[PDB]
UniProtKB/Swiss-Prot annotation, chain A:
<dbReference type="GO" id="GO:0016887">
    <property type="term" value="F:ATP hydrolysis activity"/>
</dbReference>
<dbReference type="GO" id="GO:0000439">
    <property type="term" value="C:transcription factor TFIIH core complex"/>
</dbReference>
<keyword id="KW-0539">Nucleus</keyword>
<keyword id="KW-0227">DNA damage</keyword>
<feature type="binding site">
    <location>
        <begin position="97"/>
        <end position="104"/>
    </location>
    <ligand>
        <name>ATP</name>
    </ligand>
</feature>
<dbReference type="GO" id="GO:0008104">
    <property type="term" value="P:protein localization"/>
</dbReference>
<dbReference type="GO" id="GO:0006979">
    <property type="term" value="P:response to oxidative stress"/>
</dbReference>
UniProtKB/Swiss-Prot annotation, chain B:
<comment type="subunit">
    <text>(Microbial infection) Interacts with varicella-zoster virus IE63 protein.</text>
</comment>
<comment type="subunit">
    <text>Component of the TFIID-containing RNA polymerase II pre-initiation complex that is composed of TBP and at least GTF2A1, GTF2A2, GTF2E1, GTF2E2, GTF2F1, GTF2H2, GTF2H3, GTF2H4, GTF2H5, GTF2B, TCEA1, ERCC2 and ERCC3. Component of the 7-subunit TFIIH core complex composed of XPB/ERCC3, XPD/ERCC2, GTF2H1, GTF2H2, GTF2H3, GTF2H4 and GTF2H5, which is active in NER. The core complex associates with the 3-subunit CDK-activating kinase (CAK) module composed of CCNH/cyclin H, CDK7 and MNAT1 to form the 10-subunit holoenzyme (holo-TFIIH) active in transcription.</text>
</comment>
<feature type="modified residue" description="Phosphotyrosine">
    <location>
        <position position="42"/>
    </location>
</feature>
<comment type="similarity">
    <text>Belongs to the GTF2H2 family.</text>
</comment>
<protein>
    <recommendedName>
        <fullName>General transcription factor IIH subunit 2</fullName>
    </recommendedName>
</protein>
<comment type="function">
    <text>Component of the general transcription and DNA repair factor IIH (TFIIH) core complex, which is involved in general and transcription-coupled nucleotide excision repair (NER) of damaged DNA and, when complexed to CAK, in RNA transcription by RNA polymerase II. In NER, TFIIH acts by opening DNA around the lesion to allow the excision of the damaged oligonucleotide and its replacement by a new DNA fragment. In transcription, TFIIH has an essential role in transcription initiation.</text>
</comment>
<feature type="domain" description="VWFA">
    <location>
        <begin position="7"/>
        <end position="183"/>
    </location>
</feature>
Curated annotation (Swiss-Prot), chain C:
<comment type="similarity">
    <text>Belongs to the helicase family. RAD3/XPD subfamily.</text>
</comment>
<comment type="function">
    <text>ATP-dependent 5'-3' DNA helicase. Component of the general transcription and DNA repair factor IIH (TFIIH) core complex, not absolutely essential for minimal transcription in vitro. Required for transcription-coupled nucleotide excision repair (NER) of damaged DNA; recognizes damaged bases. Sequestered in chromatin on UV-damaged DNA. When complexed to CDK-activating kinase (CAK), involved in transcription by RNA polymerase II. In NER, TFIIH acts by opening DNA around the lesion to allow the excision of the damaged oligonucleotide and its replacement by a new DNA fragment.</text>
</comment>
<feature type="region of interest" description="Mediates interaction with MMS19">
    <location>
        <begin position="1"/>
        <end position="152"/>
    </location>
</feature>
<comment type="subunit">
    <text>(Microbial infection) Interacts with Epstein-Barr virus EBNA2.</text>
</comment>
<protein>
    <recommendedName>
        <fullName>General transcription and DNA repair factor IIH helicase subunit XPD</fullName>
    </recommendedName>
</protein>
<comment type="subunit">
    <text>Component of the 7-subunit TFIIH core complex composed of XPB/ERCC3, XPD/ERCC2, GTF2H1, GTF2H2, GTF2H3, GTF2H4 and GTF2H5, which is active in NER. The core complex associates with the 3-subunit CDK-activating kinase (CAK) module composed of CCNH/cyclin H, CDK7 and MNAT1 to form the 10-subunit holoenzyme (holo-TFIIH) active in transcription. Interacts with GTF2H2 (p44) which stimulates the 5'-3' helicase activity of this subunit. Component of the MMXD complex, which includes CIAO1, ERCC2, CIAO2B, MMS19 and SLC25A5. Interacts with CIAO1 and CIAO2B; the interaction WITH CIAO2B is direct.</text>
</comment>
Length: 475, 188, 152
């Protein structure tokens, strides 16, 4: 019976003396006792099923957060917190929802419900500042106990939620990675007990994974929309944070005056003289440019901007590369936003795009993703298949697009487009993209021709024009 | 069946409440569609007879068909009405006064009848409706109401005082049973 | 007697005596009656704490004012809304005559306030029986203690 049972720590492992012979592990591996990774503590179901239990004799009895107030979440979010009360730590650990519908609120509520000494992990200071703005109803004495805790200073019991910090490892002041042995876990090194991760996909990377791996970490919750990069690490995240409690929030459940119905499309474009000579012959990182700048595909992108500006729709055009961004945008004479565009000029372009009926198309680089209060529109065009994550295409779509007036309860009232050059490595991403979006509940189709592109003025009207671009791209 | 001749004024509720999806597609669509089925069955049972069609909508009365002995006008009018739908609130007093004016003219041995399909709860008319009910019973104009989910007392008294036919309809099957009871002739 | 009294105990409690008991009518099925309760329908419906129901504006505005309007507009029949006091009644229905500009029901209902008059009471019952939602016993507000309890 476990009334005497010691349990300890060695470098990243838990060893269990004079044992109760617990299920699901090897025995006398190198001594009479059981020995697991720290990170295996998460598997509380394997003892719970057996009817086994354990005690935290290493406890520290100091004080904790109360945060008694409540707020109202979306109908699926409220169902998702209600499930978490239901399931408990044996059968909980991540939630997936867009970066534009209430993820900050799920984190402050997840900490106010769970109610333990908490450390909040985030990607960015702006997101700490959005959390703070969310959290003001549960903030103790409004503004006299909230503080930041990162590379310049630390103070107070709370802040953006409870104490927030960043994932970073540049040196001794880049907080969570550097501090990962001092404070954090109620059962051993026992100052705190609860972990809330915003942007949770960020942690399972090869160096970062160690922050999570080198503890027992009692309670853990993660929140994300991108969830994984193109190589799919996500089997690891079940171990590292916990299993996935939720994924859906389909626009099928929020149509009539609520968000958008999006017609999704992929566009297959043919390939014009000289560009495949050179695509086929070049194996280097330049070849990404011959498939993206393919003038038949540029003419589809131009024709599509013209159709939706003729109807006065608002359009964001995404370009994965600053070269591509500027070659498309300067030719189409639409503003662009990227890293080196300043805050003053970005806020002028974005205010113009949202409120000026003359400024209806803009071009944007990777800086939106994971973070850029991206503005509202009704049309999204991606010039390329990229290598950022099929799941980030759906986060980006979801956070940017809304219903056009009048038509707020129809089958579709917003539009997404991804442009693909036929007979290239750009095509490989489609059978995955297509399966992903339809599994996310989206109506998605393939457009393979445009015989009305043969009825109007567009660029690249000759071989000589196309040759002028081909020489510039090759250089 | 032959023995006497009937005059019947079909009155339909074209208020905003008739748009509702409670009774197939919506009440307006289900009622006009079954009412077309009734006209042909009543005229087949009653070869020497007449009907006229009135609606109450947007706080007024309108004549969809004039009083006549050819069924074709009435099914063509029920077809033409569905497109223009229903909005607003009844005008029952003005509809019983135009119906009265046509029915008073008719000779001694023919019936005087008003059939009303009712999905409202009152009517917009200022005029004193009780004076007009007293006048219907003197004139021998009989008024029947088929109501949708509704027993509001002035309508029920108005159908009882004029002859005894306030009925409630809760399905498309029950409404076809009610119209088919009205297809049935009077004694002579 | 009092119509119903089946749990029996309160009368012997009040008497400090133990009468002979008897149930002396044949009753009808439960299905002719329906006795609902209302409190909310999603997990975000938190405005009904009623720690100070006489002061909780958000709670009066939310399902107390809003559920009444949903139920009355959907269920279009003659329906009387009973309140615990005049002050609640006045706050819940903005009416023609509002206690503030900030009150949360907009729909044709009739009032039943103090200085009720025996002749004036009948006018409101004539209106409710005749037609429309509104009248005495119809879409009208009355405090449950008040005279409307005599009925017609």
């Amino acid at each position: 019976i476990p009334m005497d049972l010691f349990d300890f720590y060695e470098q990243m492992d838990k060893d269990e003396e004079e044992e109760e012979e617990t299920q699901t592990v090897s025995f006398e591996v190198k001594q009479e006792m059981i020995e697991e990774l720290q990170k295996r503590c998460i598997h509380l179901e394997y003892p719970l099923l057996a009817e086994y239990d354990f005690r935290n004799d290493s406890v520290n009895p100091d004080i904790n957060i109360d945060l008694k107030p409540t707020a109202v979440l979306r109908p699926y979010q409220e169902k998702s917190l209600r499930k978490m009360f239901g399931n408990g730590r044996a059968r909980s650990g991540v939630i997936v929802l867009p970066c534009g519908a209430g993820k900050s609120l799920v984190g402050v509520t997840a900490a106010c419900t769970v109610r333990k000494r908490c450390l909040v992990l985030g990607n960015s200071a702006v997101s700490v500042e959005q959390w703070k703005a969310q959290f003001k109803m549960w903030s103790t004495i409004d503004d006299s106990q909230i503080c930041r805790f990162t590379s310049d200073a630390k103070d107070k019991p709370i802040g953006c939620s409870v104490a927030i910090s960043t994932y970073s490892m540049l040196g001794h002041t880049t907080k969570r990675s550097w501090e990962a042995e001092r404070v954090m876990e109620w059962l051993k090194t026992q100052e705190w007990g609860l972990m809330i991760l915003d942007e949770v996909h960020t942690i399972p990377a090869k160096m970062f994974r160690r922050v999570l791996t080198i503890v027992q970490a009692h309670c853990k919750l993660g929140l994300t929309a991108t969830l994984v990069r193109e190589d799919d690490k996500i089997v690891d995240l079940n171990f590292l944070i916990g299993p996935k409690l939720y994924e859906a929030n389909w626009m099928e459940l929020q149509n009539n005056g609520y968000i958008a119905k999006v017609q999704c499309a992929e566009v297959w474009c043919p390939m014009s003289p000289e560009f495949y000579r050179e695509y086929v012959a070049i194996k280097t990182k330049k070849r990404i440019l011959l498939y993206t700048m393919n003038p038949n595909k540029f003419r589809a992108c131009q024709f599509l901007i013209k159709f939706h500006e003729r109807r006065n729709d608002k359009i964001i055009v995404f370009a994965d590369n600053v070269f591509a961004l500027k070659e498309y945008a300067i030719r189409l004479n639409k503003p662009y936003i990227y890293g080196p565009t300043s805050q003053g000029e970005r806020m002028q372009i974005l205010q113009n795009f949202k409120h000026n009926p003359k400024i209806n198309t803009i071009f944007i680089s990777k800086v939106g993703d994971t973070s850029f209060d991206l503005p509202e529109a009704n049309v999204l065009i991606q010039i390329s298949s990229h290598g950022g994550s099929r799941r980030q295409e759906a986060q980006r779509l979801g956070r940017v697009l809304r219903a056009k007036k009048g038509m707020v309860a129809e089958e579709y009232n917003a539009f997404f487009y991804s442009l693909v050059s036929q007979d290239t490595q750009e095509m490989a991403y489609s059978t995955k993209r297509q399966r992903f979006l339809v599994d996310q509940g989206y109506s998605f189709k393939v457009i393979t021709k445009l015989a009305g592109m043969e009825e109007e003025d567009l660029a690249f009207s000759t071989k000589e024009e196309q040759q002028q671009l081909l020489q510039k791209v090759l250089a | 069946r032959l023995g006497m001749m009937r005059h019947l004024y079909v009155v339909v509720d074209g208020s905003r409440t008739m748009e509702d999806q409670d009774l197939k597609p919506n009440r307006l669509t289900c009622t006009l569609k079954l009412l077309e089925y009734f006209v042909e069955e009543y005229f087949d049972q009653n070869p020497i007879s007449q009907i006229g069609i009135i609606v109450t909508k947007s706080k007024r009365a309108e004549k969809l068909t004039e009083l006549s002995g050819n069924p074709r006008k009435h099914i063509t009018s029920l077809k033409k009405a569905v497109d223009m739908t229903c909005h607003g609130e009844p005008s029952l007093y003005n509809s019983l006064s135009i119906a009265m004016q046509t029915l008073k003219h008719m000779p001694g041995h023919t019936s005087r009848e008003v059939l009303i399909i009712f999905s409202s709860l009152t009517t917009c008319d200022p005029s004193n409706i009780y004076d007009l009910i007293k006048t219907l019973k003197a004139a021998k104009i009989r008024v029947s109401v088929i109501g949708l989910s509704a027993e509001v007392r002035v309508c029920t008294v108005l159908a009882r005082e004029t002859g005894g036919t306030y009925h409630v309809i809760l399905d498309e099957s029950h409404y076809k049973e009610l119209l088919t009871h009205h297809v049935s002739p009077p004694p002579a | 007697t009092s119509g119903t009294l089946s749990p029996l105990d309160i009368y012997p409690k009040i008497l400090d005596f133990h009468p002979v008991t008897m149930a002396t009518f044949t009753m009808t099925l439960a299905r002719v009656c329906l006795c609902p309760m209302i409190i909310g329908r999603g997990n975000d419906q938190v405005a009904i704490s009623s720690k100070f129901e006489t002061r909780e504006d958000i709670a009066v505005i939310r399902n107390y004012g809003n559920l009444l309007l949903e139920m009355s507009a959907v269920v279009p029949d003659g329906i009387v809304a009973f309140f615990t006091s005049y002050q609640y009644m006045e706050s819940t229905v903005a009416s023609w005559y509002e206690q503030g500009i900030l009150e949360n029901i907009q729909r044709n209902k009739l009032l039943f306030i103090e200085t009720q008059d025996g002749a004036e009471t009948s006018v409101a019952l004539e209106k409710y029986q005749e037609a429309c939602e509104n009248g005495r016993g119809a879409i009208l507000l009355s405090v449950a203690r008040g005279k409307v309890s005599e009925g017609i």
